[model samples]
Target chain A: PQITLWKRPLVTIRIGGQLKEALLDTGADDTVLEEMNLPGKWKPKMIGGIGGFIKVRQYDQIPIEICGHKAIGTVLVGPTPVNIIGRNLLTQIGCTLNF
Target chain B: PQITLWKRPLVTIRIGGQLKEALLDTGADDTVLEEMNLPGKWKPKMIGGIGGFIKVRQYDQIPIEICGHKAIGTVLVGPTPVNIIGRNLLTQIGCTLNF
Candidate 1:
């Protein structure tokens, strides 16, 4: 499936059996969700963005569905202003830039 | 041309005959370049990201070359920590998400 780039490349995503909307953020190095509870072991890590840095709980081997495409990988749970689907999951779904 | 989704999606962009690396930020609403002198009339506007809002100079009809693709349109210039190519420019170059 192909989707045109929007002002914000937002898409529906399902994580931990829950549905949420997220921005397909290629600028972000890691996928970040607005504080959510997922059953798993997590390690605290710091991530920097346009602002400064935020400590996030990194959970490994999590399953996520982005626009109906399935992916399993690490997800960072943090106090993010918005949910972001980073490159880690984008590659899993075979997303690319084409002209 | 096709480019895979890298961890940062950083690409070489040419603006005003100057070469620079910028992030292909799908989440960003407008293209913002690090402080530079671009020839055009600009109006001051505020833009927000993960951190906060920054005042920018919006220049219209600016030509930018992104990864060999030519795009001419409005580009925001400001004190951005990094140069970002947003949807405004991405769409002009026919970039989309494909799987």
Candidate 2:
């Protein structure tokens, strides 16, 4: 898929009240977050893709303040074996890759 | 906790084109789908729960034709070692429990 970068510089997102720096990918239609850096309320959804769908929950989209602003739409509400942001909430945020 | 039963009769749901019987638990605030009977679009997200943050995913709510009607809502998206449906899509259906 086409991976776009965020207009802003690489930013850091907080999960579980901890901060993890990440790149903004506009190409990502999903809000892909890392497994390790997940927040307290983020749950998982059981989805089927190339890997097939499974049960999972995610933390509800809350106020994500970034660079003196806050994201209003739902963030990518899923998880990963490793942390990676993808298309779940990215599209809602009007995201594209930076570089 | 107050574990209320569903007002609807126990019904079976389809995942990945497979069918399994599940109880509709309205008390479960979160729509809980089964891990095993996942569809082909759900994804996982790592979360911080009692055990701590871990990555998991679920199937998106599709046009599930159950009984004589269709459920239009976000199905509980997530996976488990086994399959069970709780509050994921039930609440959206105005589901109460049927004994």
Candidate 3:
């Protein structure tokens, strides 16, 4: 049974020739990239958090090459615990999270 | 083996008396709560995203009672797939993630 659970995509981000495992979250209207590893040429958005607010913004919309599927959307350019591949791609090809 | 891979907390949210499992992601610089389940006592913030930015604000700080450990901090109320018990609690107490 294919249940429609919100499945976050897991992708390998190739930044500066390095690969990193990222969580694709549609819940995230924005694409979140780790700030420490954020590539240059991206802008910043001042935001709030548990530790008060900080100025971090969304920045890239690159190709996420899935095994046989792919999509492109904006990526959040900030420091997140994990890189979330959010709605930018999920909405294109509808997905369902089945446990 | 004490490996500290960022561990988002899992809590049984008793908001309006409904409980759900939320991810405690430190990477989620902001305390993200599912907008659908958000308590109607928070505020909003305008921000950016991979999709050209949006209005998402941080607004509340509450008491989070964990497994015998409790802490008070600010939380981000938003429309997230899951309620994230992020850094607000993680940073204060040190725990390890064992795979």
List the candidate 1 regions with Cα displacement exceeding 4 Å: none
**lDDT per prediction?**
0.86, 0.41, 0.49
Report the lDDT of model 3 for residue A26.
29
Candidate ranking under TM-score, highest first, comes to 1, 3, 2
The candidate, 2 or 3, that scores higher on TM-score is: 3
* Candidate 3 CAPRI-style tier: incorrect
On lDDT, the candidate that comes out on top is 1
Interface RMSD of 3: 13.1
Off by over 4 Å in 2: A1-99, B1-9, B37-41, B47-54, B66-68, B76-82, B97-99
Cα error of candidate 3 at position A67, Å: 4.6
Per-residue CA lDDT of candidate 3, range B1-99, in tens? Answer: 121222322445444345557654433444566565444476667534333334554656565554434555666665444567554554433422211
After TM-score superposition, the amount by which residue A36's alpha carbon in candidate 2 deviates from its true location, in angstroms, is: 34
Better of 1 and 3 by DockQ: 1
> For candidate 1, lDDT tens digit of each residue in B1-99?
777886577889999899999998887778999899999689998887666567889999999999998999989988777899999999999888778
lDDT for position A60 in model 2: 60
Sort the candidates on lDDT, descending order: 1, 3, 2
